[PDB]
From a paper:
A total of 228,461 particle images extracted from 5,962 cryo-EM micrographs were analyzed. They were separated into two classes in the 2D class averages, with them showing either 35- or 34-fold rotational symmetry on the S-ring. No other symmetry in the 2D class averages was observed, indicating that the purified MS-ring consisted of 35 or 34 subunits of the FliFG fusion proteins, and there was no other variation. Because the MS-ring in the native flagellar motor is thought to comprise 34 FliF subunits, it is inferred that the 34-fold rotational symmetry structure reflects the native S-ring structure, whereas the 35-fold rotational symmetry structure is an artificial structure induced by the overexpression of FliFG fusion proteins alone. After postprocess without symmetry correction, their resolutions of 35 and 34 subunit MS-rings were 3.76 and 4.28 Å, respectively. Consequently, we built the atomic model of the S-ring part (RBM3–β-collar) at 3.23 and 3.33 Å resolutions from the maps of both classes after C35 and C34 rotational symmetry corrections, respectively. The monomeric structures in the S-ring part from the 35- and 34-mer structures are almost identical (RMSD = 0.286 Å). Our S-ring structures are composed of 34 or 35 molecules of the FliFG fusion protein. Their diameters differ: the outer and inner diameters are about 26.0 nm and 9.6 nm, respectively, in the 35-mer ring, and about 25.2 nm and 9.4 nm, respectively, in the 34-mer ring. The difference in the outer and inner circumferences derived from these diameters is approximately 2.4 nm and 0.7 nm, respectively, which are roughly equal to the calculated differences produced by one subunit.
Residue numbers in the entry:
A (entry chain 3), B (entry chain 2), C (entry chain 1), D (entry chain Z), E (entry chain 4): 254 to 327, 367 to 402, 418 to 453
Write the structure that this text describes.
């Protein structure tokens, strides 16, 4: 029944996180080294279904088709005009599974501020940090344990 | 009958908690160590079904189609106009199983305030702490037993 | 017949309590120890069935379609206008088995006030104590028997 | 025939009492000891069947559809307006077997007032004592026999 | 069912990234050397479906077909004209899978500013950096590990 329509979304969300983690590991491994960093990510998405239909008009450019006028003097002023305007019709079907938010957190074993800024700048391209969706990207250094 | 439509939600909710716990363990294990921390999470969700239909209009941009006027002087002032406006139709089907609230609690075996703040900042990205849904995230340190 | 529609709810309610007790035990066991605490929980739920249908209108943004006017002077002032407004239709089906109230009671074998407050703060995240549903959470220390 | 529709309720009521007694025993046994307390509970419930249908309106936000006016001076003042309002329809089916009242009585073998208050506070969470349904919870200490 | 309509998009997006990475590697390998650089890319795309229908008119060039006039003097001035205008009809079906954004990040093992600018200029042609889609291209040099 419907028990399979949600678990598929659950596995898809997990697969996205796994791919993002794999992409993250490829960049930080040769620069920081093995076992000198930890990172985890998560993605939240929605599976709604939206259909849109739009019909627009242009009132600034009217075109006349039939026109009748009467200008009786002595004072009758009668006018009857027909107009035809531009018509635009649009039909749109949205996607299902758009990414809503994305959070990335990176911890580096103990670094000055310049190196942290450089690492953040490098990771920005690798991740796709975008402010429109309210994504969060944090990178920081702490002392590990032995 | 309907006895299977709720137990599926119960197993799905448990599976979400298990995955979140597994993600939590991966980050805190190498930094804090084995047996130096405990953490548990819970998620509350709803399984409603909402359908939406919207029809919008634009009254600020009217377009004229037929127009008749009479300006008899001597004083008859008659007007008859027909208008056509923009039409927009939208149909939306919402998802079933959206997350409502999320609570995370972390206890660390005995730490200064800076380390606690750093750990909270690290866990924020790993969990997905969001203030819009009223999620709760608490991290603190207590003395364990022997 | 209908003798099975209520016993299923009875087993579901018992299963929820068992899972909550298991979650409680996992956190308090390593911090307090074996046999130094007791705790029990209960959950009350309802199994009603509610369907909702809503139809909303926007009276602040009217759009004119047909308009006729007469401004006879000498003083006839006649007007006839047709309007079209935004229409919104919503249909909602609620869930069956929502949690109404939740009570948790914890007794610790003999503790200062700070440790009690810390334990309560830890258990708040583990349980999901929410004031909207009027949930109750009590933690206290008493002297056991030998 | 109908001889089975009531005995099922009788066994369900007995099963609820048995489960509540089992939950009570689990908490008081390690704190008070074996054979130092006695307790019994009862639950009263109803098995009615109620269906509800509601139709609500919003008179404070009317929307105009058709309007005709006449303001003849010399003094005829005629108006004809049509309105459309928000419509809400709800259908609800209640549950069968809601708990009406609940009484708990606890006797402890001979205790100061503080210990009695602490025991009552512990049992409140374990039972679910609620004042809305007029539930009764009594705990007291008497001298047993030998 | 629909579980295959999204995984295909997931593999297509991964294939685009793989091809872009392969193109990147071909240029930077002979100039920088083996193991002296790291780079990763990502592409975000949408899979909507848009159909467009347009009907345009030219009101500045009207052509007369039938004309009747009356210029009675003594003063009746009556005119009745019919017009025919240019008509244009367009139907368009958009593509599915257009690229929305593109981010590239390059790190070079430790370089002056001139060499960095030259490398960025070289990579601009190889990637296709375009400001219309808000693409991001970052190139920088950091100290690696040993």
């Amino acid at each position: 029944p419907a028990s399979a329509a949600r678990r598929k979304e659950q596995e898809l969300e997990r697969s996205q996180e796994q791919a993002l983690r794999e992409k993250i590991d490829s960049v930080l491994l040769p620069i920081l080294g093995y076992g000198n960093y930890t990172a985890q990510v998560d993605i939240q998405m929605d599976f709604s279904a939206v259909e849109q239909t739009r019909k627009r008009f242009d009132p600034n450019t009217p075109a006349t088709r039939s026109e009748y006028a009467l200008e009786d003097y002595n004072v009758r002023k009668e006018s009857t005009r027909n107009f035809e305007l531009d018509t635009t019709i649009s039909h749109e079907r949205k996607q299902t599974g758009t990414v809503a938010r994305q959070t990335v957190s990176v911890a580096i074993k103990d670094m000055s501020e310049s190196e942290i800024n450089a690492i953040r700048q490098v990771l920005i391209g690798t991740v796709g940090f975008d402010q429109g969706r309210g994504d969060l990207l944090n990178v920081l250094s702490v002392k590990f344990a032995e």
